[PDB]
Amino acid sequence: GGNAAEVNLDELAQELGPIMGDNEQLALAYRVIRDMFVFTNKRLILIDKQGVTGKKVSYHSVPYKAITHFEVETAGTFDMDAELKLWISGQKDPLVKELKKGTDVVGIQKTIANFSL
Amino acid sequence: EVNLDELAQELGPIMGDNEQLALAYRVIRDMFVFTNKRLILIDKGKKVSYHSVPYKAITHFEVETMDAELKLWISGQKDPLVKELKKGTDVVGIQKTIANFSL
Amino acid sequence: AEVNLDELAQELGPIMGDNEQLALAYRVIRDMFVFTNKRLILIDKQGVTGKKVSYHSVPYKAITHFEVETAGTFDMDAELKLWISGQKDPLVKELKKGTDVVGIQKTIANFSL
Amino acid sequence: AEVNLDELAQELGPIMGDNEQLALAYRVIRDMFVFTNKRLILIDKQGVTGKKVSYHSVPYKAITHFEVETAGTFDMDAELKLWISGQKDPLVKELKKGTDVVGIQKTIANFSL
Amino acid sequence: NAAEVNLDELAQELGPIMGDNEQLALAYRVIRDMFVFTNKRLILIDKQGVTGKKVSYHSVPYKAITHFEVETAGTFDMDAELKLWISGQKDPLVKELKKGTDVVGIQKTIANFSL
Ligand SMILES: [Cl-]
């Protein structure tokens, strides 16, 4: 449960530009409250903020080449969301993410396939 | 036998722009779908799992045999994917396709 | 002791890749090391000793490192350890006196390095 | 550029590959991050004299994923984590305020993605 | 105390397990153990003692070396340790580099063949 909001990629590109690769482009980005899940043409950037003021911030880059396998499991009911599991090389447990209402569930999967296969 | 024209229709939206269905096998009520880029294990109510294993992530594999059992080991992890290939499954075909598409 | 590869190509044909060919093979008691242009296939049988047959395919890129340890003993037995990508524990194979231990090592070198 | 790369190339040359060349370097207080065409070299000094020196090479092809997180009092510092092929635990480097944390991130992106 | 090893002699010894296209680059002996750099791999040769009949030949292709480190004790105290991380092995191989070793050349060799 909870909704994901699409993020404007022109503004995001200006704000992330300094930590982006010279030939990197943004494909897709979602916000969930303060956190962001960013698809570039080279990696996922997972931006997680912690604390009341949200000043404890991490940027976790997951290059697509580190995603060794992945899975989508459809929701059983309208009340539930589909689930994305991403296995990252060297990490035993998958990163599990709810494909919240508001996400392009098929586009997300197509992007991972476009950049990771 | 799996209707590949139909399956290609249903999986079409989650395929890579440069990706196309090649072959599929039924293994019980589940499916092994082979595209040009990955093996998709489709296991089933309204709840289905689509587990993609890119060919480039398969490090080694083994078939032991009577039913057979397939282990597919994946880059960056200890544990294999394990699949029972019961009498009825095209065991030789699955092995040929793994060889053709990964090696 | 020598493996007839023409016969072996015919037996393995159904699981080989369309671009794959056999290069060399070595018998180890009832088991075989089959080197193709793409992979080592370790074929393990129990034969009279059991029901199991295992065809274990190791593409050469997945061999991360390897070791041969020999007995300091009259038996002249050796042991091969193959470490395969993603596993910390080696696949281990006893190579008893009579095995072409040197040959298997040179071939692992030629195909994996 | 933080440092004179022509000088640095002369200094590091003896431990660099014949077809390896320096790209960029960053000071991390008394430590250094040296980016070549093939690896990141972390040059770290220990002790008040800095007599104990380590050169830790991480080839770009071995970096699987990475993370930068805020650290320290009032989140003014940063911590870089580099995960490396074939191991669970990351290489962790503390990047204290004054370091070009943004530049280092861009350069890792440029060389590892 | 490490001794340098004659490579023409060693090539004759190791030739039967070497790749047809492989060549020896550098080798050190401590008692009867050897650390061999070829152009394709490290070979770690471990014999128990001075006559212990058992021997281990551990081959580490350069591709399996995921990262590596040289740390030195001092500005004038030249003892050094080489650490080599091998894919899938948690602990690094640690080689002490004391008298008789060429610490620069070892580093050059690893850079040339691993990178
Ligand atoms: Cl480490």
Residue numbers in the entry:
A (entry chain A): 0, 9 to 124
B (entry chain E): 13 to 56, 61 to 81, 87 to 124
C (entry chain D), D (entry chain B): 12 to 124
E (entry chain C): 10 to 124
Sentences from the paper on this structure:
As part of our structural genomics effort in targeting novel protein families, we determined crystal structures of three bacterial proteins from a previously structurally uncharacterized protein family Pfam PF08000 [also known as domain of unknown function family 1696 (DUF1696)],11 which appears to be involved in the bacterial cell envelope stress response. These structures share a common domain that is surprisingly similar to the eukaryotic PH-like domains, thus providing the first direct evidence for the existence of PH-like domains in prokaryotes. PHb1 and PHb2 share a common domain that is structurally similar to eukaryotic PH domains, which we have defined as a PHb domain (PH domain in bacteria). The PHb proteins form oligomeric ring assemblies of different sizes and symmetries, providing an excellent example of how molecular architecture can evolve, where the general form of the molecular assembly is preserved, but its size is expandable.
To our surprise, these structures had similarity to eukaryotic PH-like domains that we now define as bacterial PH domain-like proteins from group 1 (PHb1) {S. loihica [PHb1(sl), residues 9–124] and S. amazonensis [PHb1(sa), residues 1–125]} and from group 2 (PHb2) [E. sibiricum 255-15 (PHb2, residues 13–204)]. PHb1(sl) (residues 9–124) has only a single PHb domain that consists of the canonical seven β-strands in two β-sheets (β1–β4 and β5–β7) and a C-terminal helix (α1). It has an additional short β-strand β0 that connects to β1 with a large loop containing helix α0 that packs against the β1–β4 surface. The final model of PHb1(sl) contains 561 amino acid residues, 1 chloride ion, 7 (4S)-2-methyl-2,4-pentanediols, and 322 waters in the asu. PHb1(sl) and PHb1(sa) form a disk with non-crystallographic C5 symmetry that is normally only encountered in viruses with icosahedral capsids. The PHb1(sl) pentamer buries a total surface area of 9080 Å2 (34% of total surface area, 1816 Å2 per monomer). The formation of the pentamer in PHb1(sl) is mediated primarily through hydrogen-bonding interactions. β4 and β5 of two adjacent protomers form an antiparallel β-sheet, consisting of five hydrogen bonds between their main-chain atoms. As a result, the β0–β4 and β5–β7 of the next protomer form an extended eight-stranded β-sheet, arranged like the blades of a propeller (β-blade) at the base of the pentamer. The second contact point in the pentamer involves α1 (residues 113–121) from one monomer and the 310 helix region (residues 25–29) of the adjacent protomer. In PHb1(sl), these residues include Asp42 from β2, Asp55 and Gln57 from β3, and Lys63 from β4, as well as residues from the adjacent protomer: Glu80 from β5 and Asp86, Asp88, and Glu90 from β6.
